Amino acid sequence: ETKCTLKSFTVEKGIYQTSNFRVQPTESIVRFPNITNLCPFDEVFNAT
Amino acid sequence: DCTMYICGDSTECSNLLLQYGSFCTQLKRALTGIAVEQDKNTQEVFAQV
């Protein structure tokens, strides 16, 4: 990777920065309020 | 870090950024050069004995 970054097949003595490390997320979470305000859809559809 | 700063986690943003070229190579090179320059200044100043 150091070779690939320097764009050369030979590397001299030293310290070289090559890439970045970052922990990838594990899973996704979605949060919303207590959505319970339902309309009278059923009360209208089942009306006599 | 160019990716983290400009785009972050956006892979499509990274793909769009890759079209701009080698700006970030120059950016990182200049930053590392400034770091090494500050280190060399500290050394030349305080390591005379």
PDB file of C-alpha atoms in Angstrom:
ATOM      1  CA  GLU A   1       0.000   0.000   0.000  1.00  0.00           C
ATOM      2  CA  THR A   2       2.910   2.366   0.665  1.00  0.00           C
ATOM      3  CA  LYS A   3       4.266   1.511  -2.789  1.00  0.00           C
ATOM      4  CA  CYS A   4       0.816   2.060  -4.310  1.00  0.00           C
ATOM      5  CA  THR A   5       0.497   5.443  -2.588  1.00  0.00           C
ATOM      6  CA  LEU A   6       3.970   6.684  -3.540  1.00  0.00           C
ATOM      7  CA  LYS A   7       3.380   5.451  -7.118  1.00  0.00           C
ATOM      8  CA  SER A   8       6.773   3.737  -7.078  1.00  0.00           C
ATOM      9  CA  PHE A   9       8.071   0.188  -6.719  1.00  0.00           C
ATOM     10  CA  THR A  10      10.795   1.237  -4.240  1.00  0.00           C
ATOM     11  CA  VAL A  11      10.387   2.983  -0.880  1.00  0.00           C
ATOM     12  CA  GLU A  12      13.092   4.694   1.164  1.00  0.00           C
ATOM     13  CA  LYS A  13      13.500   4.795   4.936  1.00  0.00           C
ATOM     14  CA  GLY A  14      10.820   6.912   6.564  1.00  0.00           C
ATOM     15  CA  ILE A  15       7.243   7.157   7.781  1.00  0.00           C
ATOM     16  CA  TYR A  16       4.519   7.398   5.128  1.00  0.00           C
ATOM     17  CA  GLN A  17       0.807   8.146   5.454  1.00  0.00           C
ATOM     18  CA  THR A  18      -1.165   5.849   3.153  1.00  0.00           C
ATOM     19  CA  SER A  19      -4.868   5.578   4.052  1.00  0.00           C
ATOM     20  CA  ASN A  20      -7.537   6.302   6.657  1.00  0.00           C
ATOM     21  CA  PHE A  21      -9.037   3.879   9.176  1.00  0.00           C
ATOM     22  CA  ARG A  22     -12.660   4.236  10.278  1.00  0.00           C
ATOM     23  CA  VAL A  23     -15.058   1.821  11.974  1.00  0.00           C
ATOM     24  CA  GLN A  24     -17.984   1.149   9.651  1.00  0.00           C
ATOM     25  CA  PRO A  25     -21.494   1.273  11.161  1.00  0.00           C
ATOM     26  CA  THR A  26     -22.988  -2.020  12.309  1.00  0.00           C
ATOM     27  CA  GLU A  27     -26.734  -1.465  11.853  1.00  0.00           C
ATOM     28  CA  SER A  28     -29.269   1.318  11.333  1.00  0.00           C
ATOM     29  CA  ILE A  29     -31.813   2.617  13.857  1.00  0.00           C
ATOM     30  CA  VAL A  30     -34.906   4.726  13.140  1.00  0.00           C
ATOM     31  CA  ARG A  31     -36.787   6.595  15.870  1.00  0.00           C
ATOM     32  CA  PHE A  32     -40.086   8.478  15.825  1.00  0.00           C
ATOM     33  CA  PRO A  33     -42.706   9.542  18.388  1.00  0.00           C
ATOM     34  CA  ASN A  34     -45.564   7.338  19.578  1.00  0.00           C
ATOM     35  CA  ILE A  35     -47.527   7.608  16.336  1.00  0.00           C
ATOM     36  CA  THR A  36     -51.006   6.434  17.359  1.00  0.00           C
ATOM     37  CA  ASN A  37     -53.280   9.215  16.024  1.00  0.00           C
ATOM     38  CA  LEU A  38     -55.362   7.062  13.681  1.00  0.00           C
ATOM     39  CA  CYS A  39     -58.140   8.349  11.561  1.00  0.00           C
ATOM     40  CA  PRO A  40     -61.679   6.774  11.452  1.00  0.00           C
ATOM     41  CA  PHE A  41     -60.742   4.805   8.335  1.00  0.00           C
ATOM     42  CA  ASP A  42     -62.045   1.572   9.863  1.00  0.00           C
ATOM     43  CA  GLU A  43     -65.021   3.266  11.529  1.00  0.00           C
ATOM     44  CA  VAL A  44     -66.053   4.656   8.131  1.00  0.00           C
ATOM     45  CA  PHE A  45     -65.362   1.520   6.087  1.00  0.00           C
ATOM     46  CA  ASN A  46     -67.278  -0.781   8.464  1.00  0.00           C
ATOM     47  CA  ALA A  47     -70.235   1.599   8.839  1.00  0.00           C
ATOM     48  CA  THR A  48     -73.722   0.185   8.286  1.00  0.00           C
TER      49      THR A  48
ATOM     50  CA  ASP B   1      -8.764  13.838   5.519  1.00  0.00           C
ATOM     51  CA  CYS B   2     -10.291  14.898   2.197  1.00  0.00           C
ATOM     52  CA  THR B   3     -12.932  12.160   2.138  1.00  0.00           C
ATOM     53  CA  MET B   4     -14.162  12.774   5.688  1.00  0.00           C
ATOM     54  CA  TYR B   5     -14.164  16.564   5.328  1.00  0.00           C
ATOM     55  CA  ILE B   6     -15.607  17.113   1.848  1.00  0.00           C
ATOM     56  CA  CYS B   7     -17.882  14.074   1.520  1.00  0.00           C
ATOM     57  CA  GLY B   8     -17.961  12.129   4.784  1.00  0.00           C
ATOM     58  CA  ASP B   9     -19.656   8.755   4.396  1.00  0.00           C
ATOM     59  CA  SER B  10     -21.319   9.500   1.034  1.00  0.00           C
ATOM     60  CA  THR B  11     -20.041   6.979  -1.515  1.00  0.00           C
ATOM     61  CA  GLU B  12     -21.675   8.805  -4.429  1.00  0.00           C
ATOM     62  CA  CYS B  13     -20.045  12.003  -3.164  1.00  0.00           C
ATOM     63  CA  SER B  14     -16.695  10.199  -3.106  1.00  0.00           C
ATOM     64  CA  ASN B  15     -17.277   9.002  -6.673  1.00  0.00           C
ATOM     65  CA  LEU B  16     -18.042  12.574  -7.755  1.00  0.00           C
ATOM     66  CA  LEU B  17     -14.949  13.836  -5.915  1.00  0.00           C
ATOM     67  CA  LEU B  18     -12.680  11.320  -7.658  1.00  0.00           C
ATOM     68  CA  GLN B  19     -13.474  13.191 -10.894  1.00  0.00           C
ATOM     69  CA  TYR B  20     -11.765  16.389  -9.693  1.00  0.00           C
ATOM     70  CA  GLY B  21      -8.270  14.875  -9.851  1.00  0.00           C
ATOM     71  CA  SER B  22      -5.196  15.156  -7.626  1.00  0.00           C
ATOM     72  CA  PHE B  23      -6.109  18.210  -5.531  1.00  0.00           C
ATOM     73  CA  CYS B  24      -6.059  16.189  -2.317  1.00  0.00           C
ATOM     74  CA  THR B  25      -2.618  14.716  -2.994  1.00  0.00           C
ATOM     75  CA  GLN B  26      -1.277  18.278  -3.093  1.00  0.00           C
ATOM     76  CA  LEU B  27      -3.293  19.227  -0.003  1.00  0.00           C
ATOM     77  CA  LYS B  28      -1.967  16.318   2.071  1.00  0.00           C
ATOM     78  CA  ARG B  29       1.567  16.868   0.767  1.00  0.00           C
ATOM     79  CA  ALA B  30       1.482  20.531   1.801  1.00  0.00           C
ATOM     80  CA  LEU B  31       0.090  19.681   5.240  1.00  0.00           C
ATOM     81  CA  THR B  32       2.735  17.014   5.879  1.00  0.00           C
ATOM     82  CA  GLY B  33       5.393  19.433   4.645  1.00  0.00           C
ATOM     83  CA  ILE B  34       4.188  22.068   7.104  1.00  0.00           C
ATOM     84  CA  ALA B  35       4.290  19.485   9.897  1.00  0.00           C
ATOM     85  CA  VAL B  36       7.839  18.413   9.029  1.00  0.00           C
ATOM     86  CA  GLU B  37       8.828  22.085   8.753  1.00  0.00           C
ATOM     87  CA  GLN B  38       7.540  22.845  12.252  1.00  0.00           C
ATOM     88  CA  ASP B  39       9.370  19.783  13.580  1.00  0.00           C
ATOM     89  CA  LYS B  40      12.602  20.850  11.864  1.00  0.00           C
ATOM     90  CA  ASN B  41      12.193  24.361  13.282  1.00  0.00           C
ATOM     91  CA  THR B  42      11.764  23.020  16.813  1.00  0.00           C
ATOM     92  CA  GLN B  43      14.818  20.794  16.343  1.00  0.00           C
ATOM     93  CA  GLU B  44      17.070  23.503  14.887  1.00  0.00           C
ATOM     94  CA  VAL B  45      15.994  25.860  17.680  1.00  0.00           C
ATOM     95  CA  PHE B  46      16.187  23.677  20.794  1.00  0.00           C
ATOM     96  CA  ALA B  47      18.794  21.031  19.820  1.00  0.00           C
ATOM     97  CA  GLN B  48      21.805  23.321  19.361  1.00  0.00           C
ATOM     98  CA  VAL B  49      23.663  21.891  22.368  1.00  0.00           C
TER      99      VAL B  49
END
